[PDB]
Amino acid sequence: EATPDAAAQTKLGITAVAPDQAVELRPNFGEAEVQAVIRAAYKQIFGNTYILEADRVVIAESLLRNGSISVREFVRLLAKSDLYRDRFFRTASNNRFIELNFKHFLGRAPYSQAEIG
Amino acid sequence: MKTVITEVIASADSQGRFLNNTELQAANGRFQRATASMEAARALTSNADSLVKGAVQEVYNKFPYLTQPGQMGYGDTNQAKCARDISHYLRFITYSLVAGGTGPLDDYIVAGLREVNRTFNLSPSWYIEALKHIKGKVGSQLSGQPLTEANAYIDYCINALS
Amino acid sequence: MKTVITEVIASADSQGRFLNNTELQAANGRFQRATASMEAARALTSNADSLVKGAVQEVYNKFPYLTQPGQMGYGDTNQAKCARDISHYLRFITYSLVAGGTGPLDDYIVAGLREVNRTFNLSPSWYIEALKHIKGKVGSQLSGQPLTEANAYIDYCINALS
Amino acid sequence: MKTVITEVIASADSQGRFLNNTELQAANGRFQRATASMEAARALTSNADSLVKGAVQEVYNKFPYLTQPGQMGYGDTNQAKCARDISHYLRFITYSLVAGGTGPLDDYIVAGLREVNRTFNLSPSWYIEALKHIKGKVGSQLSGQPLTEANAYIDYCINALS
Amino acid sequence: MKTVITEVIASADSQGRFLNNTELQAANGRFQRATASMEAARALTSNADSLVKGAVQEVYNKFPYLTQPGQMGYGDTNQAKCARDISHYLRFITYSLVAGGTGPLDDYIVAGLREVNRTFNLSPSWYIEALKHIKGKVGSQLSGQPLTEANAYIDYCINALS
Amino acid sequence: MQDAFTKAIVAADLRGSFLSEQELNQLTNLVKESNKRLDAVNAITGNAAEIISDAAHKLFAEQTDLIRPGGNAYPNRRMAACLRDMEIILRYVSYALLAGDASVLEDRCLNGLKETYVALGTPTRSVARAVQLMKETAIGYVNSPSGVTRGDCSALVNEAATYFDKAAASIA
Amino acid sequence: MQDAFTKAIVAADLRGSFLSEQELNQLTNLVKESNKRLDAVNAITGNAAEIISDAAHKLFAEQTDLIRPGGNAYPNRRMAACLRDMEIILRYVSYALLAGDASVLEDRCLNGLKETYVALGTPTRSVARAVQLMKETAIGYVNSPSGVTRGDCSALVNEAATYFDKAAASIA
Amino acid sequence: MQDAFTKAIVAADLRGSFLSEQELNQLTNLVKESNKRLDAVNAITGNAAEIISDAAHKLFAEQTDLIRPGGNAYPNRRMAACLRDMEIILRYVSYALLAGDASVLEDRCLNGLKETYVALGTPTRSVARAVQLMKETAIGYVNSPSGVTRGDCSALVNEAATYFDKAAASIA
Amino acid sequence: MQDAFTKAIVAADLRGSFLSEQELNQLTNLVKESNKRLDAVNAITGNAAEIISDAAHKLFAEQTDLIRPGGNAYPNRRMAACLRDMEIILRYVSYALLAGDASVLEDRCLNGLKETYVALGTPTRSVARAVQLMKETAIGYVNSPSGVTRGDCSALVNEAATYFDKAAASIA
Ligand SMILES: *[C@H](C)[C@H]1/C(=C/c2[nH]c(/C=C3N=C(/C=C4\NC(=O)C(CC)=C4C)C(C)=C\3CCC(=O)O)c(CCC(=O)O)c2C)NC(=O)[C@@H]1C
């Protein structure tokens, strides 16, 4: 009984995310390069939910251009957003919130009940 | 949905603390204002229709060419839609007055406004006139704080549209 | 520092949005309240001293052993401190009334309260009595909303201490 | 700026690996196409002006009311601008043909398009006509692959505008 | 799996945009090249066996001691494996020619190469010779671009092994 | 989130209509009570610490075993949690009371709560008990304050109850 | 990911064999069509905006309720999402068309989609309808271009169809 | 952050004293003006879009080079930023106006703005100009409303000015 | 990033003009060389491992102390870094070579490198040396291939050199 390599991935539809491409902001970044990190960050950090024009956070991503803040600081600004609160936390229970924060902030899920506590 | 009351709860909740005097003060504000707000809503709700007709109409005066054949303003379907739409704007405004926050407006009207409008080639301009015309009429039926409130919300949309 | 006014600004600032009707309603709430708040502060500020004496005193009645030699209540330095401390609590409370938020209290008194108290072996209990005794006196000089306000803040501390 | 060559470099660079056969194949593609692309650019560059006149004009035929007083199309300043703008579109297109990528278009024209247009109340529609009219003219001076290329880029904008 | 076609899709997909001219140019490159690539594969596929024999053999000439008893090259099982392995390398190479990318090589052969080799004490060196010997033979049956392609891929492995 | 007003809106929206005059009169009335409503909340928050403290004492006097080795409130670590939880529930309840709507309470707090407790091995029964103990104490304050203008708060008192009870039920 | 070439490889691999001469000739032929294939894609991408715009209009003329209060396309926010979705589906389809393989479409785009739609309450049937509406319009362009050398694209046209249909089916 | 009230407190704190009666009387009167103060803010926010739109037009009519190739407001991308910035500054100014204190504007926005602009090659002067253009338009509204109770707003108007000017200065 | 084409564009843009006919002819010519250009790159990438290996051996034969205790290439950990670095520089150089522009090399790779090396106590001189050693070996391949159509690559060869040299200089 034979399986193509990457059969395990294609079942479970983890094919896209299994090995996952990293996006890095680089020095003297171009205008298109930054746009791509933003695009990525909003997809991971936010949930794969839809960010409409109104939703976007102008001030945080302006600082990301001109290197005032790093991407780690960009992520922190995104995470403390009416928008992040409105989705995620305000409707969720603390168990569902903490489990969501693991994932968006770090790809893993929570390893144990202690971590939740 | 963003109203005064929901917000203070939210803020309290974030910090993880009981509602203290700070927040109640705020709440109190919302409640005392309500009397005026509520009044305004009763007034708009009643004259709705008349406001709508007047607006739609206006738009056409402002942009005659819309009514010509092969344009968007042309043929009843479109006119019907145009009416419907403005009704909505109004409806929501009333809601917001009563809810005591922009909440209702934000979630129904504003969020996604741009893209919708882009994809169907609705010109913000039009809506705006509608609103303005309205604002002008409302500026007769109301007065004092009731009026003030009505304006605020009406404008809020103008700004969102533009 | 957390007051009504500062918060709404903050919230508006985070979202990146103009202050709309929502927030102003809240602000209106504060400032409306202020009249009562201000009154309360004038009352506490004036009777300060007398309130303090009375409180310190009380504490000793409540916990006689403190005044015995080898204890904390004993020897003037300590008494002086005891006075000073309560003065502070009071001072801040007035501040908070005027500022229209717990802000002043939180940052001066509350933050770090526990650890300070632990390291110097100040028993929360004491402070509490002080406050309670105060509350009781204030419950004569004031009335109606002014009173209500005074209480709120006084309590806020009780809860933080306990 | 996004061209074929820059992209493969970027991708290679991200993974941290040397350019292998995969990428070169791609590059080769860009270079083979260039001959046609370059030809197209020579053709647009030469007829620029004439294309522009024709377009601007068209727009007015399509939207007569623009030329009426108190409108946007009215008074030379505006016409001048209108011309300028279209020139730009064209200019960039040529650039993109030569660069062998949308890059030039994206960064000059497209990024920020919406907001600019909103704030100054430029209707995308207009531009579009301009382009279409152009496309039609270009559809004579060019042929075969050169043509095909020209179209691609022209369209790319239409889609971005709409 | 990394081929030209998959990559451009991927890149397009990440940015969230349609395949525009940029990417198609690249694709075109892959397809034009294919004719040469395909030719090369037909040539290797046919002579497979003979190439394999020759290689295995070579390795032993290069490293006589392997064939001595108590070594790795010694006793048929091992020889069989040795053959098998090289076959694989070849097989994949053909694949990669046809797929028009290193992908097939990367995912089958390269990923995990080191650790496998470490744990079973396969010396990269060996493989390398195999390949080199091959490269030399291929350098007769092929010519011009077909050849060039063949090399590229063969090398790609040499570098990965070393 | 949601509250009394917003809720009514939403309903109205799906009908597609302006708010019914009848419906306004619910809200109009609701406003009038505000002052009462507020004081109620104020009373809870002011007494918070105590409310809990009290309820706890009573809880542990009843179910001695919780605090015995092998029980769920032992050792300290656990005890701490148990206190913390009580408080939270209270906090939310208060929130609801202000909003004039259960929602906030349901969504943040009650949703999933039972199951959590279950997975941990926390005895849901006892939790519920605690909630009630709290309820009674809390009402105590709401209903007997000092320096407040005398009048009837019953309406509010009952709504308070309900919130507590929703909690009790869903946990249990 | 996967595409026509890669796929054939993988098959060959499980047999454990070098590629059949017959099988090469599939790929050889596939190459020859490239040019056609490309133009097809180019046609979609060029007309994208419009394809959608169009389909939408028709979708909403048919299923009036979607745009009525209580429907799934109301209010604005929802409408916007629906438009975005249509675009995404299209985008993928195109990708597939280039690859010469459904896979990409199935995995990234269709995978999970039904369940999502269910959770949201979005009516899968209507979605499917939209997809078809798109299909027809799209083919329209693929099949009727200007300034392209005249010849037969049918083969491609049909494959295009199939992709659209896989979409329709898996959503539905 | 800070505002009029908080500020006075802080001062008092360092002296270590209760608030002076004199000082209260500042705040007492400040309260009285509230209503005016509020309306002022409301006026800006209500007209925001316009204020900017207007200012921009005038800015570009004057400094035509900004919008020519090689200028700082070209191309679109840049233009967009320039608009965005203007707006922000406005937003903060309003905030201050409500607070009754410059602080918020200076700390959040002005501190370091100049240097940024410099590093980018944005001409600080022009920025400042824009800010003034805005100022005038804004005052225009603050000072000429309809359906507000007629009275004297000067006091507020001037304070508004100052805020705008602090901005202009620190940028410039 | 940037490259030869994009660069010329950008220049043209600031003038505000279509591309000069003269300027086109640079690019036109550049295209003609492509095939040569490509092979050059291909040669480096194909031999990468070796290029380095080689250079290293020679580097260490010359500067024995680097590999002695107290030197900068000792112990293993450091040695590893040193190898890695060499490679990187190479990688970039190649990139540049394809682009037809130094930029990529300067901006990602060379910028700041000197100072780093300094802070660590890495002897910049030696680094530079390594880079040259690499250069010569690399050219070796570029310039002496087999199965390539014979012709003149000098033009490319020199440009290659320059890249290596920019590296050497900025490090040194
Ligand atoms: C439009 C033809 C129909 C429609 C669609 C619809 N979708 C949503 C909401 C979502 N749709 C998706 C789907 C996707 N995410 C992806 O990445 C992909 C492609 C890989 C898809 C297709 C998602 C995730 C959402 C949630 C968005 C979010 O997170 O905010 C809605 C809106 C529902 C809502 O209330 O948000 C709609 C309307 N529904 C119709 O009625 C049309 C027939």
Ligand SMILES: *[C@H](C)[C@H]1/C(=C/c2[nH]c(/C=C3N=C(/C=C4\NC(=O)C(CC)=C4C)C(C)=C\3CCC(=O)O)c(CCC(=O)O)c2C)NC(=O)[C@@H]1C
């Ligand atoms: C009136 C000033 C002009 C006009 C309007 C008009 N609108 C549409 C179509 C739509 N308008 C809206 C508006 C809303 N729908 C919502 O759900 C909300 C939020 C509650 C709003 C504000 C929407 C979304 C649509 C698209 C879907 C639909 O079919 O309604 C049209 C038709 C456009 C078309 O392409 O068919 C028109 C014409 N008509 C006039 O006479 C004025 C010019």
Ligand SMILES: *[C@H](C)[C@H]1/C(=C/c2[nH]c(/C=C3N=C(/C=C4\NC(=O)C(CC)=C4C)C(C)=C\3CCC(=O)O)c(CCC(=O)O)c2C)NC(=O)[C@@H]1C
């Ligand atoms: C009064 C009930 C009892 C008492 C008090 C007492 N306090 C101290 C020492 C300190 N008291 C405080 C408290 C504060 N300092 C602050 O900055 C604030 C916030 C504005 C408060 C509330 C602090 C910090 C100290 C530590 C040292 C200091 O004096 O600043 C003492 C001295 C105890 C010691 O040995 O350090 C005493 C005794 N005095 C009495 O008699 C009562 C029992």
Ligand SMILES: *[C@H](C)[C@H]1/C(=C/c2[nH]c(/C=C3N=C(/C=C4\NC(=O)C(CC)=C4C)C(C)=C\3CCC(=O)O)c(CCC(=O)O)c2C)NC(=O)[C@@H]1C
């Ligand atoms: C022509 C179709 C219509 C028209 C045009 C018109 N445009 C403007 C103003 C601007 N147009 C642009 C466009 C660009 N500037 C750029 O930098 C780029 C990208 C490089 C583009 C495409 C911009 C940015 C402006 C604003 C700046 C400026 O106006 O100088 C106007 C002026 C409108 C106003 O000032 O409010 C006009 C009128 N007018 C016509 O005749 C047609 C209807």
Ligand SMILES: *[C@H](C)[C@H]1/C(=C/c2[nH]c(/C=C3N=C(/C=C4\NC(=O)C(CC)=C4C)C(C)=C\3CCC(=O)O)c(CCC(=O)O)c2C)NC(=O)[C@@H]1C
């Ligand atoms: C040939 C040059 C030498 C030789 C080789 C040899 N190989 C093994 C065992 C393995 N070789 C590989 C290599 C691959 N297997 C794969 O799946 C792939 C990817 C497609 C490769 C490249 C593997 C994985 C093994 C280990 C698993 C296995 O049991 O085969 C051996 C046997 C090693 C042992 O210790 O049993 C040998 C000897 N034999 C010779 O004569 C040359 C010296």
Ligand SMILES: *[C@H](C)[C@H]1/C(=C/c2[nH]c(/C=C3N=C(/C=C4\NC(=O)C(CC)=C4C)C(C)=C\3CCC(=O)O)c(CCC(=O)O)c2C)NC(=O)[C@@H]1C
């Ligand atoms: C006290 C009346 C009872 C009690 C409580 C108890 N709880 C835990 C642990 C947790 N309880 C919760 C509570 C919540 N999660 C939420 O999201 C909310 C609403 C926002 C609440 C109220 C959670 C998250 C935990 C798990 C994390 C943790 O372990 O701290 C314990 C500890 C369980 C353990 O075995 O450690 C306890 C003891 N148990 C009793 O004995 C009382 C009847």
Ligand SMILES: *[C@H](C)[C@H]1/C(=C/c2[nH]c(/C=C3N=C(/C=C4\NC(=O)C(CC)=C4C)C(C)=C\3CCC(=O)O)c(CCC(=O)O)c2C)NC(=O)[C@@H]1C
């Ligand atoms: C009900 C549980 C108990 C009670 C309450 C009660 N309160 C009032 C009237 C007022 N109470 C307040 C309190 C506030 N208003 C606010 O804005 C705030 C937060 C900033 C508070 C804390 C106020 C201002 C009023 C109005 C003025 C006044 O004191 O009369 C009443 C009277 C009824 C009414 O206001 O309609 C009552 C009944 N008193 C009881 O009898 C219950 C035990």
Ligand SMILES: *[C@H](C)[C@H]1/C(=C/c2[nH]c(/C=C3N=C(/C=C4\NC(=O)C(CC)=C4C)C(C)=C\3CCC(=O)O)c(CCC(=O)O)c2C)NC(=O)[C@@H]1C
């Ligand atoms: C099919 C839907 C319609 C059609 C297509 C068609 N195309 C060609 C030929 C070519 N089309 C291209 C297009 C490209 N090649 C590329 O490299 C790129 C990306 C940069 C594109 C867009 C090319 C280069 C050719 C070759 C020259 C030519 O234009 O003919 C044909 C001819 C047949 C062939 O095998 O090439 C056809 C039929 N024509 C139709 O009638 C269909 C509706």
Ligand SMILES: *[C@H](C)[C@H]1/C(=C/c2[nH]c(/C=C3N=C(/C=C4\NC(=O)C(CC)=C4C)C(C)=C\3CCC(=O)O)c(CCC(=O)O)c2C)NC(=O)[C@@H]1C
């Ligand atoms: C418009 C009146 C003038 C102008 C503006 C302009 N600014 C930038 C770039 C930036 N502006 C800022 C500033 C802010 N971002 C913030 O978060 C805040 C509040 C703290 C401000 C005020 C920043 C962060 C940037 C850099 C990154 C970005 O683009 O967001 C530009 C663009 C410059 C560029 O190189 O892209 C411009 C055009 N310049 C003019 O021409 C006008 C006179």
Ligand SMILES: *[C@H](C)[C@H]1/C(=C/c2[nH]c(/C=C3N=C(/C=C4\NC(=O)C(CC)=C4C)C(C)=C\3CCC(=O)O)c(CCC(=O)O)c2C)NC(=O)[C@@H]1C
């Ligand atoms: C000043 C810039 C111009 C002006 C203002 C003005 N306003 C009033 C009185 C009031 N204005 C308000 C407005 C609000 N109060 C709030 O709570 C809110 C937010 C929800 C607002 C926006 C109110 C309620 C009053 C009180 C009386 C009233 O019905 O307006 C005055 C009169 C003086 C006063 O302080 O009462 C004035 C002068 N009108 C002008 O003449 C200036 C051009």
Ligand SMILES: *[C@H](C)[C@H]1/C(=C/c2[nH]c(/C=C3N=C(/C=C4\NC(=O)C(CC)=C4C)C(C)=C\3CCC(=O)O)c(CCC(=O)O)c2C)NC(=O)[C@@H]1C
């Ligand atoms: C230069 C350092 C050496 C040299 C180069 C040289 N190459 C050619 C011609 C070609 N080389 C290639 C190479 C590629 N084209 C591709 O698409 C790819 C990537 C997949 C490669 C690797 C090709 C296709 C050609 C054209 C056809 C051919 O048979 O070569 C030449 C000939 C001149 C020309 O530009 O056509 C030359 C001179 N020759 C040397 O002697 C140098 C040492």
